[PDB]
Amino acid sequence: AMRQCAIYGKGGIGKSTTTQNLVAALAEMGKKVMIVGCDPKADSTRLILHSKAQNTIMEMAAEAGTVEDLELEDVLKAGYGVKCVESGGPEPGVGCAGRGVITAINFLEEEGAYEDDLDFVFYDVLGDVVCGGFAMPIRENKAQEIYIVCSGEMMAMYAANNISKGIVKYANSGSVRLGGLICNSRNTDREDELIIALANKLGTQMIHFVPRDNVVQRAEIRRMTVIEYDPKAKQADEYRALARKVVDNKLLVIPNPITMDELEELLMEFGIMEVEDESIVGK
Amino acid sequence: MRQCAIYGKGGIGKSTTTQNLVAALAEMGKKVMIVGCDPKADSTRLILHSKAQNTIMEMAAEAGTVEDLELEDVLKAGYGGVKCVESGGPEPGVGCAGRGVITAINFLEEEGAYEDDLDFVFYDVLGDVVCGGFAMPIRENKAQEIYIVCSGEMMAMYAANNISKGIVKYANSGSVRLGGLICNSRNTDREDELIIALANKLGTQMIHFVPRDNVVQRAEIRRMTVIEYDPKAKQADEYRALARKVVDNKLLVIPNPITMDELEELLMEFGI
Amino acid sequence: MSREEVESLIQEVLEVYPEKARKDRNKHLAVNDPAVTQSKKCIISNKKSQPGLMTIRGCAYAGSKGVVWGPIKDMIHISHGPVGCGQYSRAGRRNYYIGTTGVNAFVTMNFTSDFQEKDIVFGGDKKLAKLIDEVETLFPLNKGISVQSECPIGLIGDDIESVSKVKGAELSKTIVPVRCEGFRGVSQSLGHHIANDAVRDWVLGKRDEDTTFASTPYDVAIIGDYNIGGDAWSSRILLEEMGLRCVAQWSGDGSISEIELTPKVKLNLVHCYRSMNYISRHMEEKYGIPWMEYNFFGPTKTIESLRAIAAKFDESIQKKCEEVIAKYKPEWEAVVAKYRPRLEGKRVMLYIGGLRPRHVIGAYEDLGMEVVGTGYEFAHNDDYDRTMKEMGDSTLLYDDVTGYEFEEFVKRIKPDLIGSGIKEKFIFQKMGIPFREMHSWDYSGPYHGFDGFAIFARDMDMTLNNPCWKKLQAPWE
Amino acid sequence: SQQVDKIKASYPLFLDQDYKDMLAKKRDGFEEKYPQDKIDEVFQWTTTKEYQELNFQREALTVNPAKACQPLGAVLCALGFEKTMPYVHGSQGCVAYFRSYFNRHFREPVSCVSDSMTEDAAVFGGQQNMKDGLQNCKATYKPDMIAVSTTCMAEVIGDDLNAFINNSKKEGFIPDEFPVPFAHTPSFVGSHVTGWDNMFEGIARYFTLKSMDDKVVGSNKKINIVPGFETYLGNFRVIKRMLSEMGVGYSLLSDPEEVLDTPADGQFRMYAGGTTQEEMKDAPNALNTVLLQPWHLEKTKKFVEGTWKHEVPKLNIPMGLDWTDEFLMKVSEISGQPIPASLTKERGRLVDMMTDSHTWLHGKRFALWGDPDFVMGLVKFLLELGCEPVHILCHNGNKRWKKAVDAILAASPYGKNATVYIGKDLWHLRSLVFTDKPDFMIGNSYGKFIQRDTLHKGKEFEVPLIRIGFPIFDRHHLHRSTTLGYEGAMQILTTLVNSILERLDEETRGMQATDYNHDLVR
Amino acid sequence: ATIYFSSPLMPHNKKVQAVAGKRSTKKGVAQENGVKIPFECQDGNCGSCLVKITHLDGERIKGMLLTDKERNVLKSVGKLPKSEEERAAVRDLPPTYRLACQTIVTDEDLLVEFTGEPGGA
Amino acid sequence: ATIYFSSPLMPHNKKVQAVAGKRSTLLGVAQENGVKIPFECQDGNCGSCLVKITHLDGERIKGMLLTDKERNVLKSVGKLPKSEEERAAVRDLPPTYRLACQTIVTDEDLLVEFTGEPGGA
């Protein structure tokens, strides 16, 4: 009755907004969803709780002394009918930045937030680099279905390739699978077909393509999801379609990572980068 | 409320300089609090006119534990409305000598003696060794401003350097800064600019130069502080100017330690 | 109501104490505010008693030998040390059991080392070994031995753990040493923890590699019910009629096999938090067995607890719970109809250390009685967190109340009834206030469940409304 | 299931069919109980002679003892002085158990305090505990005197009360002139009677050791009486009545009957009666001092003879006929007052009651236990009634006491079968009454579990119990009775003969089976 | 009871077997085995004997009593956080930092770390 | 061999009994007892199984071989001072920081601490 899902991608493309809007759309269907923000930025529950920032598990453990004394109520905050928690992160420069994730999920599993009283559990995970903590939900079989947010940018599809490499590495010991690719518009002409070709190369699909709408900033200025701000807007319709196809998603495949030259030629194929030649290297 | 601490080696006029500072500040209508972080029970004798203020550790020992201690018996008010706290240490050889400072600061915070519309709190801390409860105000970010009392002697400059190193160690964990270098004279040639040179070498600014005279001792016999013993004294006005420079001080910097050979050369090329 | 004059009353009562005693005792007397969830800002508990003020608390030996280990029937409990400690605690607690005493059950018995001066001086461990050998010789049908240490055992310096290990390996029988010395702990509260630790370390993990027990998905375990006057049986019959099967009882009428089989249980039913929360938490961490608190005092609390327990199982258990509630409705309804008019609107003060005062308040309110003051000698801060909601506004709360304080509070408040132990029973019976022995149920009971509610109501009516209370003053006075 | 008109307590509610089925299910499922055949076989084994030999080969394990620890007797002694607070330097559990024990026996409030010594006092001693406890007790409960005894904790760690009390007095915790007598009462030495003796000796030494210059024997022309560990109010009352009837000036020392029998009139008297400090100061002016229970009053006897210069008479406890006569004659000789006609009439009435009931008492076999002096007096009285003691038990007896009881038995033709046991417990007595069945047992309530055991073997093997001693828990207001003097002998005779008659009536109640002996007149 | 003493002054960690519950404290155990823990008082008011206790058998943690004197001394050297004080008050569980002269050996495996300096740095 | 696993991720340290010298390494012992040390490779080059091992019985320290693969991984992680390398090379004594996948259990009492992160912060 519980579908454990994670959203990965390079920082700065819209993982948090897409995740929050997907949860908002799911809550309309009567589903009960829970959000875990495994990103050190700690802003993945902003648009749901209407607050300036949710207090992180690490912050509470530091102010209280240890994680064993922490309660669920001050850690789990219920807004829009869905539960929200934030992993946080350590001080930049010491430890491993993903350690907070390891502190969070573990704590949750010992407190009972992981009991199947919920239809959907989602992990907004930073996927700019795949190391301990940020690959722990893949290594410890804590995320069945992974969705990668990607734009028509070289770095975004590099991050998608790296996350798929991690998935295929941990494909033989667990049921962690790639459920599809989500594209957020960067005002690029050929980006839709570009990530279509990328997903075809990787052996996966687009779940959906999200248009760049200026109403998302108007929704965030109220610390609000776009679904609640205009229930009748077309961006809300796109988010609802993305949610319904996430629910109806049944293609869970082990991806086929491509090389750097393949990514370079895929960028070449759609005009984002010009044609390289060997005779024009020295001038 | 501004939290300031006075450090330096023992015997350099630290206590009486702090007492004159706080009495001068109280002359202007400000209200100040004194916490004596020196094991010697003499940090508050010149503003209360007493043989020796009973320390927090002594009362805690006599009253069983510190939980039975009351704020009224430890907080005594003196001339100018000053609040006086005295933190005695344990007997020699019995544990850390800095337990008194930790106990007293914790007790003062627990009983809420800081928020009572105070403006200045002064911690008179021993600076011979920076460790235990003596480095505790720097460790816990209790005193935001720190002033070191030194003279043109090797021990005093080394103590100032050690306190500067202690400030550097805990610089990143809180807003603990070295405001300046208070200079006390022992009637020796070429001392003022020696201390100005030390302060410029380790990044701070000299606050004020205090000359040695006999009026402070005549006031000391009467258990009296200089300013309200005789307000028209030249040294009384010098203490007033020192207080004015302290209150209107806005330079807060992180010092840089100087090596042993650097201090030796600085002492040598100035004629001593 | 009327919090101002109860505050001033606290101030007047605290006037005779010396400064230090007054300062400490001021923290343990409070005025109840039901809108408070953290009692630590209102009352302070689990602190040492002031010397020489006639406290009611006991020792850890009483809280371990006399409370947790004592009700276990087929084991032999050796009071290691002088005779008196086991003598005064023999058969003083009405933990009921079924067994042949002296053959296979040894609850009312008193096994003691009976230390002399030569034992105080020269060791004492070899005496313990010889005692174990004699116990095995004369009592072959016992299923275990516990050694509850008294005060001198730790003081002189003794290793009862090595003796326990050696003799258990030699005789192939479990020996549990319990360092329940009287000086350890400020009250009986630490005795519960020590006994729970002993069970966890020497008994609970015995049947870990065994899987010969056929467990059903309705298995439960009663933990924290010590069968005073048959309380545990009255709770057990209700639990069994609901469709649940109970394999363990902790520890009233309990056995070694029930303790060993408890880890094979789907739900832990904890009645007394204070004495068994440690073992419940350990079994939740290790074996993953969930646990909850239930209350069987009065009809309302019994129905609430039955529904809450049924909510943790399938629909058939809920239907069975509805069946038993419908079956037992007319009984307690008739008891209420008969006894509430005689007891309506009468005020009661309570002082029982541990879980009972918060629990009994619902049963009292069921008969129209109001609790005006309450307190526990050994309860911790979580207990006071739990009881503030139950008690009425501006009512009196005390912790480790002394004899003088309790007497002055009773004289000022003038309640209609006081429920407390034997040590204060005759004191308040002299002053003409009806008294009930809450710890022993005044040699009556049981009080748990619907069957116990009738006895509860009858007892309170017979004591509060007795004519003897109207003849205290001579006609010529 | 309960009927609102006939509400059942535990018995017989737990005899219903549903409860029986529930208990049977519990036992058969999750108890691993031994088969009933095995249980019956082991029970029958426990009643054999070989099991008795194994039981008497015990040296380390004691089962069901018949004695308590010293501070209980110390508190009982301390309770007998005017406005005196018993104080126990040690842990609080000791005081809680003492108070519960005495409340359950006397059904009266018992006041005692402890310094609540803990692990901190276990490591560093209990000087501060003593100071704070003395100050708090004096400030709160306002006693004229504080009587200090020790807990085994304080005895093992070597806490000396003299230095602690002097330090408390000289540091201002209590006034220097406040009387704080003390005694050392280790729980591993002797029993409660030894604690009573130790505490009384401590109080007497506190009040008289330093004022022996102006004391002349016989100045106040009174006789001191020391009762010892006594839990019968009637025993104090009868001694007072007999001494006042003779016109003999006396001074009862440590009599708690007043505080232990306060009336219920809407007020709580925490202090009542008791011997005043003046009578303790004037004690060595008496003509002589009489010890009512000399076998547990030896140390106070040494103190009285050595210091007070009193020729303490060699008297037994005034139980029975001969010993009461000897006590009366010795008191008359010491005080010079003749025995009046009222006491002669009372003795004649006792002899009349002895002759009236001699038929039913002759040849009856008794197994008794209790305290040394009480047991000796009871055995003597049983010998004067023609009864036959068989098993005499004293868990706190010594070799000298056993020799004295053997000498007493040898001087009567009814003591041939009698054997004396010292250091034995109630399990030994159960074995003795199983293998050598007497007619009745005589002791405290702890013997009731023996009777049940015998009833399990059979109705004809049952040995009924007679409750005379300390403590009696299952009966009400039996502490108001008397055991000393002619009155106590009368009550004991009535109890014995009526128990025998009630047993005979019970045995012959079956119609057409044994009712032919159900006589109306006995 | 097994106790492992550790210190930068000690070249090797030392394993000792101790009898639990003795009136003599961990200081007695340390002194019998020649473990140089600074003991500079006889009333337990200094902080010289401060040690860090780690329970190696986490399942076998025994409930204890934190004495008021020990609590005050631990707070005086700043080695008792509020959370651990509340834990000792409510759950009767020991804190991480203890005093050797006030620590009663329990029946478990313990690791006692000390740095050779008195409590309070 | 008695091994005490400790970690801030674990609520309680666990005491386990292990057979010394097994072909299965400390990683086998950790896996069979449910201790979650992050293992992220099968050729012993990732370094994610870095643990800190303390020999509780200093007398019973057993000499071992520090293989070149372990040495290179520890240097790539940074948990290998030159002094410990010299000690391991000359006196055949194990370093403070080890790799669980490449550590063979010896017949002694060990304390194994891990933070849950891969080796190298």
Ligand SMILES: Nc1ncnc2c1ncn2[C@@H]1O[C@H](COP(=O)(O)OP(=O)(O)O)[C@@H](O)[C@H]1O
């Ligand atoms: N669907 C969208 N259309 C337009 N802008 C978007 C959309 N989603 C996100 N953004 C913009 O991207 C910015 C940062 O995205 P964010 O979600 O913080 O990145 P991350 O995925 O790292 O959390 C936001 O300020 C937001 O305005």
Ligand SMILES: Nc1ncnc2c1ncn2[C@@H]1O[C@H](COP(=O)(O)OP(=O)(O)O)[C@@H](O)[C@H]1O
């Ligand atoms: N401005 C001054 N002029 C003359 N003597 C001074 C001056 N300041 C301090 N002294 C002397 O130096 C000594 C320093 O002692 P005090 O200031 O009481 O404590 P500390 O030894 O901590 O400085 C005093 O006894 C005082 O006589």
Ligand code: ICS
């Ligand atoms: S165990 Fe406790 S003092 Fe919970 S030591 Fe005490 S048979 Fe009381 S209020 Mo006697 S915590 Fe039980 C108790 Fe309550 S002995 Fe009984 S009645 S429910």
Ligand code: CLF
């Ligand atoms: S607090 Fe608890 S009950 Fe008290 S002694 Fe200590 S373990 Fe025991 Fe028994 S024997 Fe008598 S009453 Fe004590 S003084 Fe020595």
Ligand code: SF4
């Ligand atoms: S594993 Fe990744 S996130 Fe963690 S410290 Fe290393 S690089 Fe940073």
Ligand code: SF4
């Ligand atoms: S830290 Fe400083 S004050 Fe404390 S004991 Fe060491 S030298 Fe003394």
Ligand code: FES
């Ligand atoms: S030696 Fe001073 S506190 Fe232990």
Ligand code: FES
């Ligand atoms: S598992 Fe990767 S180095 Fe050990």
Ligand SMILES: [Fe+3]
């Ligand atoms: Fe009575």
Ligand SMILES: [Mg+2]
């Ligand atoms: Mg984000």
Ligand SMILES: [Mg+2]
């Ligand atoms: Mg000074």
